[PDB]
Paper text:
As an iron storage and release self-assembling protein cage, wild-type Ftn (wt-Ftn) comprises 24 FTH1 subunits with 12 C2 axes20. With the ultimate objective to create a biocatalysis platform that could be expressed in vivo, we report the rational design of an artificial human ferritin heavy chain (FTH1)-based metalloprotein to achieve histidine-specific aza-Michael addition with α,β-unsaturated chemical moieties. Utilizing the large area the C2 interfaces cover altogether, mutated FTH1 subunits were designed to assemble only upon divalent copper binding at the C2 interfaces hosting their histidine mutations. To still allow these sites and/or structurally induced nearby residues to chelate Cu(II) for catalyzing histidine modifications while allowing the ferritin cage to reserve its self-assembling property, instead of modifying all of the above-mentioned four copper-chelating histidines, we attempted to replace only one (R63) or two (R63/E67), which are noncopper-chelating, with histidine analogs 1–3 (4-thiazolyl-l-alanine, 1; 2-(5-bromothienyl)-l-alanine (BtA), 2; 3-methyl-l-histidine (MeH), 3), separately, via genetic code expansion.
The cryo-EM structural models of Ftn-2X-2 and Ftn-2x-3 and these two Ftns with CuCl2 supplement were solved and revealed two detailed metal binding environments. Instate of binding metal, either Fe(II) or Cu(II), at the C2 interface of Ftn-2x-2, 63BtA, 67BtA, and H60 form an aromatic cluster of pi–pi interactions. Thus, E27/E62/H65 turns to bind to Cu(II) in Ftn-2x-2-Cu(II) by replacing the sodium ion originally. With the structural analysis of the Cu(II) binding site at E27/E62/H65 of Ftn-2x-2-Cu(II) and Ftn-2x-3-Cu(II), these results indicated that our engineering is responsible for the impairment of Ftn’s Fe(II) binding. Upon CuCl2 treatment, Cu(II) contents in the two selected variants notably increased compared with wt-Ftn, whereas there were no significant changes to their Fe(II) contents.
Author numbering:
A (entry chain L), B (entry chain N), C (entry chain D), D (entry chain V), E (entry chain A), F (entry chain C): 5 to 176
The structure:
């Protein structure tokens, strides 16, 4: 056992590793989206920039989780980062909807993690999740919902002008 | 009687209290609108910002009226701030039209107040209304009329693109 | 259902709306106090300034709650802001005592809200309450208790000199 | 009962007093260590500086707990600060190990305190512990574990050169 | 024997350790006073600040004595820091009187220490006491006497207004 | 076919995708190493920092390759990022040796890619590889070889002091 480990259940350690893999997967999904919008036949540079920023933020989340795993005396166990479900989205609106679904899945995983930490009476882990992940997830979900709403109201995906103007005015 | 009271009719004091309540009600209507446009399914951030600014300005108007009530030796008598007539507006254009109607109602109340002060031969009250409220109301009504005209000409409310572009270019 | 709503119980949404109304009511009570101390026959300018600042802070609390309601996909439902129980306090000490009672009532409501969020397993809501409201309430209650203690020890309310000196030295 | 006391159980008040005494004891243990390494026959100035800083931080923790006791309307009850178990450590590595054990004991006490506050449904106390003490304890334990690991790997305590170089490069 | 020890009698070493414990005890008495005046039902913030500063100064005195013990090749032997005789003082004047009595006791101990060092022909120890402690004690006693005199003349402890004004004007 | 595609063979596109996956895999290996050295029982902070920087650089290399894929009209096809072969290295020297082997493998892949581009008469691809990857690989391999040589000469892995001093002086 680690000399620093205290009140750190093995179930919590395993769930933290699963969350690390989930954050890495989300980052790599966002990377796929970003370079989809960099394509010559899509060419929405601000969508690409937005999703690249999201990918970097997800990477940061993963790194923070690994740092906590080491802080608590757990052992990081990495797994394959699976390829994203889609190589194509055919519209900025569809990518935003997929991002919203992904963020909600990540949020559900974080909520299950918080429930596990509460059951294991690990207040440090609960506070870590609450302070660094829960409100960030809520803000991200709200922002993506706003983007989806605006794109739908503007006439996307059937209107390329809508996506162009959204790229220029909201994401630019 | 207050040691500072001079040429301050009780009718004027009561009308000032009614105007205080009206300004508070207008502020709270604007607050309702502002957070309607903050909703995920509406997501017009500049409409929300505009109406929040209007709410703060209305609060300021109310506070100025209370300060005058104290200056003249009147006694502030507060009443319930009634909830706004609408929880929903379904478009920025409808909210702008409602704001225009509200500002015209506030203006009519101020004009009746000025007529009362003129009848009571209260030149200080008349000058206070003229200097701090009448031209502000005229400017607000003109600005709201301009917004309504532009939104209607752009194709609102049937065109979500119109409201999006108006949010970006006029209110942003 | 809102596209962003996740782990947000309807009971929590209703309690948040009730808390919004409570914060608005507290702000309007503080406003009443502030302009009571602006009266010519009371004339305690720093008491008025203190209570006006408290009113603005309460308004901010209400706005933050509305923002959370929108963030979580809840729907803001506003109600009448009831007039304050008192139009008169006859002393700074009595106003401070009333403010202490009001802040304790707001705190009790927030604690019940936190208990509801804990029962509904809404860690984001629990953390929001803890981070933005609970310690602010504790600090406000402590400060008001200190003010009440100092005013009582100085000889208020029977000593106008006590309230004058407290206005100058503590609130100024 | 205190005019500010609300949702503050007597058991929580007693546990807070016990934690105050524990933090003071930890500070005084660290002080003992610091001046052990200031001895002419030990002469590890950066170890002394490190433990003096730790002592000051522990004092700060105690003061924060006393401030909370007053904020919540509890009554501070001080007890004797017992002398540290050891007047001698014969090596920097042994002092680091003792500090690690002490910090883990303090952490266990804080976790028991958080469990008590959770049982008493005192969310303000729970959030105070989580925000100001739990992650600080985790970071301190991790840092001490790192120091112990590095000292052991460098050849301490049998190698005075190891402790000298660690004093110069890690603690300096 | 220490390689640096020279003209350092064991009696002087023991007396220095006793003085270390006395300074720590005085610091902890001052800490108790400081947080007594932070209570909601006392609420004299400048009294609390004054006594907290005194506590920090006493801690500094203790640390200086420990540093001298190490400089001369003596060995620091710590003892329990006993809890202060009083948990309550019921007035700023009573706390000032207690502080005056405490400082006079510390001064008497320092004078006995100087007499011992003179008897042992330890000019370095005599000069250390004279330079760093004797005039500081005289100044502290004079300042506390001034505070006690002013509080008594102002009508303390029977006049809460006196203590409030003294807190604002002398300690603020 | 892409409107921008010109002199871009499908074999080159596939090899670029394979290289993207290889760079991502190398980044994730470096990430694993970095957080291995962040462990409490390893505690070599500058090794961790060095490998984290290497991971970020590898990510940058991958992103540059994806950007080229889009520039030339190829289509990015992502694959699973496989977990690193090792979760443990038991020494900084072993991690450096593994990094050297990994960089040589990446270099061999880049050389095969350059040979393919030369065979396909794709001078733009050849120049891209030469300008952005070949000399970077040579420099990285040389630096890792230097680190391995220095660690071996200092007595690693059997000497923890060697790895500590290397962490402080070369990587710090
Ligand atoms: Cu994330
Ligand atoms: Cu107005
Ligand atoms: Cu509030
Ligand atoms: Cu501590
Ligand atoms: Cu002293
Ligand atoms: Cu590379």
């Amino acid at each position: 056992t680690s000399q620093v480990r205290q009140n750190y259940h093995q179930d919590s350690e395993a769930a933290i590793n699963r969350q690390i893999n989930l954050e890495l997967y989300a980052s790599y999904v966002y990377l796929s989206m970003s370079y989809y919008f960099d394509r010559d036949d899509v060419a929405l540079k601000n969508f690409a920039k937005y999703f690249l920023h999201q990918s970097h933020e997800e990477a940061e989340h993963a790194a923070k989780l690994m740092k906590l795993q080491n802080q608590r005396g757990g052992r990081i166990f990495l797994q394959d980062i699976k390829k994203p479900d889609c190589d194509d989205w055919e519209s900025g609106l569809n990518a935003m909807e997929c991002a919203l679904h992904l963020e909600k899945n990540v949020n559900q995983s974080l909520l299950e993690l918080h429930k596990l930490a509460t059951d294991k009476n690990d207040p440090h882990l609960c506070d870590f999740i609450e302070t660094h992940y829960l409100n960030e997830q809520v803000k991200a979900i709200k922002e993506l919902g706003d983007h989806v709403t605006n794109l739908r109201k503007m006439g996307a995906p059937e209107s390329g002008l809508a996506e162009y103007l959204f790229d220029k005015h909201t994401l630019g």
